[PDB]
Amino acid sequence: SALLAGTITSGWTFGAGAALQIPFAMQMAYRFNGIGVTQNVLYENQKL
Amino acid sequence: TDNTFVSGNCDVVIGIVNNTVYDPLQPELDSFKEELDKYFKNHTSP
Amino acid sequence: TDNTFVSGNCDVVIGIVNNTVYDPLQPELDSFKEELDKYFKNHTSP
Numbered sequence: 136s137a138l139l140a141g142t143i144t145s146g147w148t149f150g151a152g153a154a155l156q157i158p159f160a161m162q163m164a165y166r167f168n169g170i171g172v173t174q175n176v177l178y179e180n181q182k183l
Numbered sequence: 184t185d186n187t188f189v190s191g192n193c194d195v196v197i198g199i200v201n202n203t204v205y206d207p208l209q210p211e212l213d214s215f216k217e218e219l220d221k222y223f224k225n226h227t228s229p
Numbered sequence: 230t231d232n233t234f235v236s237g238n239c240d241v242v243i244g245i246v247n248n249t250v251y252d253p254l255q256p257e258l259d260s261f262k263e264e265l266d267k268y269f270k271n272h273t274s275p
């Protein structure tokens with residue numbers, strides 16, 4: 136529960152240090168950048 | 184405009200907010216416009 | 230010119246094609262030239 140709760144509320148920050156909150160759509164936008172897809176591709180398709 | 188990039192319009196992005204985005208080229212042309220203005224001003228005088 | 234960077238010329242790259250590259254600064258100065266032109270035209274009038 137702690138690992139899963141930290142993931143959805145803080146992304147990878149809680150592993151690197153103190154758990155810094157971040158909106159999940161904002162977090163998923165950082166993840167899209169991680170795979171080489173521009174973050175606007177998330178926001179423009181967030182519902183899908 | 185250098186820190187950011189543009190895609191689409193405001194209707195699609197859930198949670199978008201309103202704030203000005205600085206175009207650094209604008210004042211670099213505005214002072215150019217004022218330089219142009221004063222050149223014209225002086226040119227009327229003689 | 231913002232989407233692309235430049236290196237060398239058209240003789241070395243195998244498979245290079247011909248296509249225009251938009252420079253967004255050009256029209257931003259072109260309408261500045263038209264603004265300038267009408268200023269001069271109006272200055273001839275009086």
Ligand SMILES: *[C@@H]1O[C@H](CO)[C@@H](O[C@@H]2O[C@H](CO)[C@@H](O[C@H]3O[C@H](CO)[C@@H](O)[C@H](O[C@H]4O[C@H](CO)[C@@H](O)[C@H](O)[C@@H]4O)[C@@H]3O)[C@H](O)[C@H]2NC(C)=O)[C@H](O)[C@H]1NC(C)=O
Nearest residue numbers: 190191192193194195196197198199200201202203204205
């Ligand atoms: C970010 O900026 C956007 C653009 O500035 C804002 O969109 C604008 O939102 C306003 C308010 O909703 C809207 O105003 C008109 O909305 C109706 C047309 O869509 C029109 O009928 C309205 O006129 C009526 O209402 C006013 C009072 O609200 C009365 O005084 C009038 O007499 C009349 O009864 C009003 O004129 C703009 O049209 C709209 N512009 C665009 C381009 O969408 C965003 O709201 C803003 N977002 C945030 C979070 O600040």
Ligand SMILES: *[C@@H]1O[C@H](CO)[C@@H](O[C@@H]2O[C@H](CO)[C@@H](O[C@H]3O[C@H](CO)[C@@H](O)[C@H](O[C@H]4O[C@H](CO)[C@@H](O)[C@H](O)[C@@H]4O)[C@@H]3O)[C@H](O)[C@H]2NC(C)=O)[C@H](O)[C@H]1NC(C)=O
Nearest residue numbers: 236237238239240241242243244245246247248249250251
């Ligand atoms: C991408 O664009 C490049 C530049 O726009 C093109 O390069 C140009 O290609 C043309 C045609 O191949 C070439 O034209 C002249 O080529 C000779 C000098 O190199 C010259 O002798 C030619 O004149 C003779 O030939 C013509 C018919 O070809 C006759 O009508 C004439 O009367 C005369 O006999 C011709 O004027 C350019 O020199 C060349 N420019 C450069 C900078 O290389 C690319 O071909 C083009 N590539 C693609 C895939 O579109």
Ligand SMILES: *[C@@H]1O[C@H](CO)[C@@H](O)[C@H](O)[C@H]1NC(C)=O
Nearest residue numbers: 158159160196197198199200
């Ligand atoms: C955040 O949630 C509140 C409700 O708790 C809502 O009123 C608000 O519009 C939301 N803002 C964004 C950007 O999603």
Ligand SMILES: *[C@@H]1O[C@H](CO)[C@@H](O)[C@H](O)[C@H]1NC(C)=O
Nearest residue numbers: 221222223224225226228229
């Ligand atoms: C204004 O015009 C005069 C010529 O009458 C010139 O000597 C002077 O340098 C000009 N100044 C400016 C700011 O254009």
Ligand SMILES: *[C@@H]1O[C@H](CO)[C@@H](O)[C@H](O)[C@H]1NC(C)=O
Nearest residue numbers: 240241242243244245246247
């Ligand atoms: C690609 O192959 C075609 C024939 O299959 C050939 O005509 C063409 O020059 C080739 N282009 C490149 C860039 O190798």
Ligand SMILES: *[C@@H]1O[C@H](CO)[C@@H](O)[C@H](O)[C@H]1NC(C)=O
Nearest residue numbers: 267268269270271272274275
């Ligand atoms: C042109 O000059 C007149 C004065 O003769 C002025 O009233 C008008 O605003 C000027 N227009 C422009 C576009 O410069």
